[PDB]
Symmetry: C4
Subunit: 388 residues, 4 copies
């Protein structure tokens, strides 16, 4: 085994082809399936895994009540091969209400945060042993990506925040060799509020498209130099913006350097990536709530903050159906690195009151240089007909 | 590992011996089992896998209601080792209401079609990653084999159809190397309507026995040349016909070049293969609906449309029990390649109205050069006692 | 991977020590467990597996009513690692209402009989594929060991029988190289009725202790010579006899050559093995029923049909608890071949009417050269309380 | 594969970071989970496994009633990967109401005890086969560690006791090479009563911190020399003592050589390990009950029996929540041997009467040299609401 360098060009991408879907909530109506949220996909050199933070209970279970709450001591990082639903034989790989995982080509890293809000612990697990931990620095919800970290040459980088979800916070970027923290750099550049980063390799470094939970409906971008540990940061230029909430396409604007200040409060984890001066991105279809999901390419969207020229829209989940988090993951091919993404399909509370629980299922798409058509792959469960 | 060439002669067949049976519906009255249809079997160099298209629900479950419907966004391809029932830990390998898979010797290829009826997408997945896709070309249910594809020296071939199910359609033969579509031939020769091909390697090429849904109750054959990508086509000569519906053994007739026009409308997926000038084949026992299943050899049935002389008949499923799709798979022995087949056992709607679901179990048999007896292996579930 | 040849002397044995227990019936009161009978154990060069003949249903399931019936088309051979009970992701490896399996050093052989009573088929599955098959020769319930077959230098051997359960029958011994029946010797010697041989390697040949269902309560021995294919047979001398029914310890008698003729009709599968002129053996504790199970050594019991001198008795199952079939398997150690045995713990119909089903669980012991205490390890389910 | 030698220095430890949590009881409210007790953790060279003793039943099962009882014939050793809860595909690896397992770098040893109280058998199982066994020596509950044994250069050591739980008993230390008992040394030195050793490698020896069920609320220490099988023993000096019951902190005292005589009757399996002259240790938070769990370093606690100077307390389970047994396990990192521990979270009878059953879940922490914060990770099931 050798380390992953990801030293290959990014695949041509004309859009995205259907890759996976686990019908988890549908299955949980006549089967024992975990209650989860904040899923993500990451792959080893051979195959892909679906990860999620479980709520320490199955769906049909009295303990599914109040799973709307996102940090308890019962939450663990669940790990299956992609498309194996989270049944009872699933491995809980660490204790976590916030995580990130990646494979460096030799083994798995998990970064798992659990504990008190004001005094959380991050565990660093490499090759199924605990190799390090770090305490919260700002004593206010230590939290990380909820999607894959990125390793190059045996150095994994990951992005962590501690501090306000509505004001300056302390974002750091950790550099990990075999589960050992070898460096911590602090967020630098003009990105003002960075959460829940979707990172992807972009040799020779990593790039991340995050959530601005404070004053932005544009998403931040963090670049990480893996060799000198330097950081830079800014925002996705595209005039069509990628956060929810946001302003409609006719009213919306952006900036390459600052939060656009447009319905900036709150957000949702999402992703984007560059393709020369254009940008690929997904977002909820509905501007104010997490309904629907679509991807498109904004032409000049990476370098021109006035560009509102999209093409190649695909509906992934139609606007009448629920979405949630999304994130990127990268997959090595023969000649090129491909880009894929998952969409968390959230069902239950608070939005939907006919059940007492909150959970999700997922749908995953991947980049293609070929052709594709259309459709919509929502969750599909009838909550009117699920357990009392 | 090495590429499969299939470059050994076909085994002697004196008939087929019992190989596998999953008792899926019988288990689902006391277990969480998937609801499926369009199953099939394919094997890697070491062992055999059973596939089916899920309905994104288990049987005992509110979402099993109305799974008579064959194309929904919830359908996925399920893959277990052969003889492992589709329990809740079964892997969904891709999104699909129509699929074909095969192993080229080094890795699996899955061909997976989902999306809108008029704008469906085929995904190609190889060694666990999405390598290609293609849009529907004629905007009318892009569909494929529902049984193993076939790979020779690195090149996998698959047959796909887009268009009318009761008139001319556009059928093509894709050539795929490591999941990459490298060439695309159009259906050629005298086969007028082609669906749901059962293909096998017949070195140096591939042969398929398909379902003419339009004007034939005889079965199309398609020869695919893997090196120059050429395609010839015709019908199964044998005067005993393999489609359902069809006319009885007395009235029935055929033709080597054209559909017979005998209750030719509609059909059922099936197989047949050549043994010199004789043909081994299976079919439902009943002439007009999917009841029973039988196999025999027709002496000169491969090459003489007037041949109505069968021998070595075996009842696989008796005429009072439901049957369904059936297809071929091939397995490499020490010195020869063998031919096996599965038979889908369909239970539920529309035919059986005591339940709201439609699902199936499978039985599987393999070519033997030894001797054998008699029996019947139906589904064995009591729908009158089932999860009501 | 080399072929096993068992060319090491038998281990010293002082008795047997607890090895494994699957608690299958106790679990199926609150989970999905298969209904089974006719279990056995065989091991690959690394680990052991447990087998049984499924009834195509789980216990808590409408389909388990009437599982007293030992031959249906829904029966399949189950295979897990030893100690993994037969839950829903258990692999069915073949269609079988009678079977035998073994591993030859490189791969599994499985011998699986199913079909009509009057015309059953044996299928021979090696290294994942069907390689051969035979019809019933005498058209009366073709059947085989229900326990491990034995392979030496790549030749496996299995004893099968076709014919009357209660008068002269046709017993053959097949030799199988890589799934291929390379020879068939007919039964020869003194043994007059032979069923369910529990065989073991005894380099350079194989030995079996069987069940006489006709006029013997002494158990038959069958010697199989693997190079010349010759067959001798006789009975186990011991004045203490293995079969059930039998006459009590005071009244019983035996013969090194002929059925002893005492309550001989009917029987139960069991085992014994020589140790110089002494014999190790197990048997039920009730002389008339499949209640309890014991093992002891009979001093000179292997060459003196007058020896009723036992020692080293162990109760495996106490006398007020149900037992059933029992069988030997062999396990290669560093310097010697050890011998072990399993005991089928039959619960339900017809002997127990609180339930509708019939099933078993199993307990497994292994030869020890060290020391050991006492106990009882019954099935332990409360049928007064199980599923309706 | 070489044998583990553990010839690495012990890791710097500043405290413990969360590693794993199985949520077993929470899950059992809506799934098929095993009833267990006396859990522990042990790792092969790659990954950790969670072991426990089952009660031969699942929780939502009639047979969970009276699982308070700790030696039945239906108790088996359960073994999964760490994080996979004990569902029905869980392997039972031997018959046990008492056990110890370790990996020597080449394979697994399991030491398994079952049988009558007055006449129990210990079976030694290595590389998946029975290699040895030993009878009870004092004919009064032969019993062993309930945590990992330790192997150095292929010689594994284990600690077993037989005799009174409240008076002088007969404690032996066995030495086992690939399954074979090669030596038995007897306990020696000043420890007067020794149960349930939590042992760990301390090159070139092995060191255990045990439970005095007689007169000591300080914990016995046993040292084991592996080359010449000599044994020394004593007690943990620390004035803060590990056992439950014990005296409160103000009132307690200890002794380096003798049971302290302070509420000695009874106790609980627990652990400790030296760090210079300092001691790391855990214990229940409540002095008299198995409520809560905590860890700390006692400054000079290893050599100064009057030290009561704790630092680096961590709460693992808050004091309003139930704990239970705990023990150590060692994981080899790149340059040092780490120390970890697991805590049994007992729920149900007799302490809690809302349910008829007794079971547990587990939490696992591992030593860290990094930093960490605070929390509490209890069982989290609600019995007011569980099955029935
Ligand atoms: C079958 O499936 C394929 C693949 O999914 C569909 O083709 C896709 O259709 C999308 C919807 O029309 C196309 O995306 C749109 O692209 C427009 C591009 O503008 C074009 O100008 C170029 C030259 O520069 C021309 O080729 C095109 O003809 C266009 O006129 C965008 O303007 C459009 O953006 C918006 O429209 C949407 C609604 O669609 C609004 O929601 C949005 O706010 C904005 O006003 C959108 O991005 C997509 O590119 C195309 N993809 C490919 C690869 O061809 C077929 O249409 C499907 N057919 C059926 C019958 O379902
Ligand atoms: C035990 O197990 C074996 C294996 O299944 C059974 O043997 C099979 O029985 C089948 C039915 O008898 C045989 O298939 C038939 O083959 C017939 C050929 O008849 C022969 O005539 C030729 C040429 O004149 C001779 O060479 C042969 O020796 C035969 O005597 C077909 O005519 C027949 O075709 C039909 O009959 C069926 C009903 O069976 C109709 O449905 C059909 O429409 C048509 O009129 C049929 O195909 C089969 O070959 C034979 N297999 C082997 C290997 O022997 C035994 O019958 C079973 N024994 C018991 C007691 O059940
Ligand atoms: C703890 O666990 C051990 C091992 O399981 C028990 O020891 C075993 O006890 C058995 C039952 O007594 C022994 O087997 C018996 O052997 C008898 C022969 O008498 C002995 O023979 C030699 C010399 O003759 C001497 O070594 C002995 O000292 C004895 O005198 C057999 O006669 C006896 O056979 C029968 O008795 C049974 C009832 O028990 C009848 O069912 C039967 O029909 C027949 O009349 C039996 O085979 C066994 O060898 C022995 N094992 C070993 C290794 O020593 C301890 O007894 C256990 N302790 C407790 C309290 O349970
Ligand atoms: C966030 O998380 C970290 C790590 O969990 C916490 O820091 C830990 O807090 C513990 C509780 O105070 C510390 O353990 C205590 O250590 C005391 C030692 O006193 C020190 O003297 C040293 C040097 O000699 C100075 O540096 C310090 O100022 C210390 O004061 C012990 O005496 C103390 O002992 C007891 O108090 C406990 C607490 O109730 C009693 O139950 C007990 O019986 C006895 O009377 C205790 O062991 C721990 O060392 C410290 N760890 C580290 C690595 O820093 C933060 O406190 C957390 N913060 C929040 C806001 O949650
Ligand atoms: C739960 O278990 C109770 C105690 O069971 C006794 O010991 C166990 C180790 C077990 O193996 C069991 O067989 C033993 O009887 C049961 O109470 C016992 O019930 C039996 C007959 O029902 C009675 O003769 C015993 O005296 C009684 N023992 C005690 C200590 O109560 C429970 O059975 C129930 O409770 C009984 C008291 C009775 O009311 C009956 O209706 C119940 O079946 C077991 N509980 C349940 C819900 O099954
Ligand atoms: C699910 O949980 C909710 C929230 O805890 C429960 O509602 C509470 O009920 C308790 C006691 O039953 C009341 O004292 C609280 O004031 C309620 N809280 C709120 C926020 O409404 C509810 O009972 C649970 N429902 C079920 C079916 O378990
Ligand atoms: C259980 O079965 C009883 C006997 O059934 C007979 O044999 C079985 C194999 C079936 O073929 C069945 O149709 C036959 O009647 C029934 O008489 C009885 O009603 C059944 N019990 C229940 C509770 O359903
Ligand atoms: C703590 C701030 C962070 C948003 C930036 O909240 C996230 C919001 C969530 C959301 O927007 O759905 C749910 C996440 N589980 C949550 N994480 C934690 C640790 O609370
Ligand atoms: C669309 C025509 C095609 C066969 C001719 O329909 C098949 C009919 C079916 C059938 O005959 O049972 C079920 C198949 N799932 C269906 N395939 C799809 C993709 O709809
Ligand atoms: C057919 C004779 C044979 C032994 C005499 O019957 C066995 C007896 C049985 C028995 O005595 O329990 C049950 C076995 N399942 C059965 N096997 C078959 C194949 O029917
Ligand atoms: C027999 C003495 C022994 C240690 C004191 O008791 C242990 C105490 C127990 C306890 O204190 O919880 C439960 C253990 N299962 C038990 N082990 C056995 C085998 O009884
Ligand atoms: C077969 O079907 C035709 C109808 O086309 C009918 O006339 C004929 O009698 C049937 N044959 C037999 C043998 O029953
Ligand atoms: C064929 O199937 C139908 C099922 O509805 C039945 O009524 C018909 O009589 C059957 N006929 C034959 C000849 O098998
Ligand atoms: C054997 O079992 C039967 C079954 O009930 C019982 O009646 C009988 O007493 C037992 N006989 C002996 C001698 O143990
Ligand atoms: C400790 O124990 C005694 C009871 O024996 C009690 O008097 C005292 O208050 C306790 N001390 C503390 C600090 O709780
Ligand atoms: Ca925002
Ligand atoms: Ca047709
Ligand atoms: Ca259930
Ligand atoms: Ca007999
Ligand atoms: Ca004590």
């Amino acid at each position: 085994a050798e380390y992953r360098n990801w030293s290959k060009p990014q695949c041509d991408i004309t859009g995205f082809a259907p890759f996976s879907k686990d019908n988890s909530i549908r299955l949980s109506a006549g089967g024992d399936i975990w209650v989860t949220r904040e899923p993500y996909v990451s792959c080893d050199p051979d195959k892909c895994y679906q990860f999620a933070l479980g709520q320490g209970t199955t769906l049909n279970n009295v303990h599914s009540n109040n799973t709307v709450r996102g940090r308890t001591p019962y939450r663990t990082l669940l790990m299956n091969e992609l498309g194996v639903p989270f049944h009872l034989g699933t491995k809980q790989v660490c204790i976590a209400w916030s995580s990130s995982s990646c494979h460096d080509g030799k083994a798995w890293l998990h970064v798992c945060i659990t504990g008190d809000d004001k005094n959380a612990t991050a565990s660093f697990i490499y090759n199924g042993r605990l190799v390090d931990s770090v305490v919260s620095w700002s004593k206010e919800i230590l939290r990380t990506q909820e999607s894959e970290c990125v390793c190059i040459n045996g150095t994994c980088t990951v992005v962590m925040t501690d501090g306000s979800a509505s004001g300056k916070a302390d974002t750091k970027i950790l550099f990990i060799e075999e589960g050992k923290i070898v460096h911590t750099s602090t967020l630098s550049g003009s990105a003002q509020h960075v959460e829940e980063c979707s990172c992807y390799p972009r040799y020779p470094g990593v790039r991340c498209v995050c959530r601005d939970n404070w004053k932005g409906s544009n998403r931040p971008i963090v670049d990480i130099n893996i060799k000198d540990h330097s950081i830079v940061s800014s925002y996705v230029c595209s005039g069509l913006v990628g956060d929810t909430p946001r302003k409609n396409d006719s009213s919306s604007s952006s900036h390459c350097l600052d939060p656009n200040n447009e319905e900036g409060g709150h957000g949702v984890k999402g992703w984007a990536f560059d393709d020369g001066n254009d940008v690929w991105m997904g977002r909820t279809i509905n501007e104010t709530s997490r309904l629907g999901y679509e991807t498109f390419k904004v032409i000049e969207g990476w370098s021109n903050p006035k560009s509102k020229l999209q093409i190649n829209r695909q509906v992934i989940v139609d606007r009448g159906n629920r979405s949630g988090y999304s994130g990127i993951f990268s997959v090595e091919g023969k000649s090129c690195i491909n880009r894929c993404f998952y969409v968390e399909l959230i069902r239950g509370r608070k939005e939907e009151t006919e059940v007492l629980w909150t959970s999700n299922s997922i749908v995953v798409f991947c980049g293609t240089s070929g052709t594709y058509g259309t459709g919509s792959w929502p969750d599909g469960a009838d909550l009117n007909l699920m357990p009392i």
